[PDB]
Amino acid sequence: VDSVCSGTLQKTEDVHLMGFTLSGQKVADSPLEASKRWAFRTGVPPKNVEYTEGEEAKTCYNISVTDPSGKSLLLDPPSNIRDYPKCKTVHHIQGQNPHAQGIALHLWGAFFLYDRVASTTMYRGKVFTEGNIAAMIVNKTVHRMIFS
Amino acid sequence: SVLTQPPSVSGAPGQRVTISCTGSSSNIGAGFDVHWYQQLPGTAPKLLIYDNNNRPSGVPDRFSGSKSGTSASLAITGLQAEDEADYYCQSYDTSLSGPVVFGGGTKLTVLQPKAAPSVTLFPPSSEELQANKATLVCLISDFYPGAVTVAWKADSSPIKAGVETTTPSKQSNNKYAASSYLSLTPEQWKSHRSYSCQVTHEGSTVEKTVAPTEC
Numbered sequence: 001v002d003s004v005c006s007g008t009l010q011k012t013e014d015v016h017l018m019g020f021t022l023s024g025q026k027v028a029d030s031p032l033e034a035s036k037r038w039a040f041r042t043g044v045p046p047k048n049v050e051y052t053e054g055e056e057a058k059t060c061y062n063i064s065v066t067d068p069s070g071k072s073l074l075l076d077p078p079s080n081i082r083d084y085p086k087c088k089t090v091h092h093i094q095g096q097n098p099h100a101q102g103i104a105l106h107l108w109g110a111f112f113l114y115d116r117v118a119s120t121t122m123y124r125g126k127v128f129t130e131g132n133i134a135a136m137i138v139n140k141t142v143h144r145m146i147f148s
Numbered sequence: 149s150v151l152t153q154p155p156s157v158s159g160a161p162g163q164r165v166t167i168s169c170t171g172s173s174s175n176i177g178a179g180f181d182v183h184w185y186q187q188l189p190g191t192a193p194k195l196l197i198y199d200n201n202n203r204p205s206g207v208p209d210r211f212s213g214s215k216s217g218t219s220a221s222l223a224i225t226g227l228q229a230e231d232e233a234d235y236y237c238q239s240y241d242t243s244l245s246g247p248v249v250f251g252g253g254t255k256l257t258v259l260q261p262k263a264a265p266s267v268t269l270f271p272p273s274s275e276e277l278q279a280n281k282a283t284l285v286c287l288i289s290d291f292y293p294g295a296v297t298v299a300w301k302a303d304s305s306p307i308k309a310g311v312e313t314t315t316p317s318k319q320s321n322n323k324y325a326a327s328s329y330l331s332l333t334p335e336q337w338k339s340h341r342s343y344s345c346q347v348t349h350e351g352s353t354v355e356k357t358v359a360p361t362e363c
């Protein structure tokens with residue numbers, strides 16, 4: 001129904017934020033292609049946001065990037081950053097950048113997805129996949145049937 | 149070994165030959181370039197093909213590279229005998245296996261005709277004999293294929309004892325070479341009239357002989 005009143009939210013638990021991948025959006029995810037969407041920049045503070053469920057990822061990345069001196073250009077992961085839950089193929093990459101400064105920011109405005117945490121930046125050594133999230137109401141009964 | 153290559157590939161001269169290299173999603177399938185190396189027997193690898201299909205100056209137009217899907221291949225047109233070597237494929241890797249990955253390696257064998265061995269047998273050195281030791285040096289090289297039988301016989305009676313024989317190994321001309329040593333005491337060398345080392349290749353047996361002749 002198109003009405004504002006259509007829909008019921010009984011507990012906060014029934015708000016579900018789902019992470020959908022860019023691979024699921026038929027976007028090229030090869031490491032060489034994927035990296036063309038990532039870029040370094042200063043003056044931007046990385047932000048993180050919690051979500052509840054996510055799509056099984058086609059591909060993920062486990063990346064460490066430094067400057068020539070060996071100092072990471074990627075931020076150390078916060079306590080609450082865990083490797084993405086379900087990746088079919090992880091791309092482990094470790095290297096250095098000759099002339100880059102700041103932090104890794106996704107170009108499309110998409111998020112770096114980890115385990116129930118989306119971010120505007122790439123965390124060093126943590127498994128992630130690219131994606132976006134969407135909010136919806138799912139009651140427990142509906143939730144129980146899907147996941148079981 | 150992570151990238152898979154043909155254990156062995158052959159071909160006649162003037163022929164077009166192909167050497168494959170297929171990996172996983174990580175090494176090639178991910179989109180990473182493929183590099184090829186040439187290794188002549190006993191030497192260090194040479195950059196043959198880089199960035200999938202490019203030739204560094206010093207490489208013939210006879211050589212060409214190609215990539216499609218999870219595979220990459222090397223093409224040789226106008227196959228020369230010079231080309232007989234060991235071939236290796238390279239690709240960046242995103243798997244647990246490290247960034248740089250090599251293939252298993254390929255024995256490229258360009259056709260050779262049958263070649264009878266050149267056998268030279270030397271009697272124990274007089275200097276060596278002074279040390280109370282005595283060895284006979286049987287040397288057969290320039291032959292193909294790499295397979296020979298060595299027989300040692302005091303006079304007319306063969307004896308399979310004191311024998312140290314090598315495995316054939318090809319030379320720069322891609323023909324094999326093998327050496328055999330017979331360890332005797334100087335008195336055994338003296339006791340018999342003559343010693344004979346005979347090598348059997350292609351149904352034809354070469355029987356050189358030596359004897360205790362001081363001069």
Ligand SMILES: *[C@@H]1O[C@H](CO)[C@@H](O[C@@H]2O[C@H](CO)[C@@H](O[C@@H]3O[C@H](CO)[C@@H](O)[C@H](O)[C@@H]3O)[C@H](O)[C@H]2NC(C)=O)[C@H](O)[C@H]1NC(C)=O
Pocket residue numbers: 062063064083092094124125126127
């Ligand atoms: C994602 O990639 C990172 C590397 O970029 C992997 O992290 C590595 O985790 C292992 C195990 O925790 C670390 O090994 C140990 O390191 C300590 C020193 O910190 C050393 O004393 C031990 O002997 C051992 O080698 C490794 O250092 C660490 N690397 C970094 C740069 O943090 C991570 O495991 C990858 N994730 C997955 C799911 O594979």
Ligand SMILES: *[C@@H]1O[C@H](CO)[C@@H](O[C@@H]2O[C@H](CO)[C@@H](O)[C@H](O)[C@H]2NC(C)=O)[C@H](O)[C@H]1NC(C)=O
Pocket residue numbers: 025027108109110131132
């Ligand atoms: C949402 O998905 C669309 C569709 O792919 C993305 O659009 C791409 O945006 C980039 C950057 O502007 C362009 O280079 C591509 O050509 C666009 N794709 C298409 C098919 O038009 C959009 O950027 C995505 N945004 C988020 C937040 O995920």
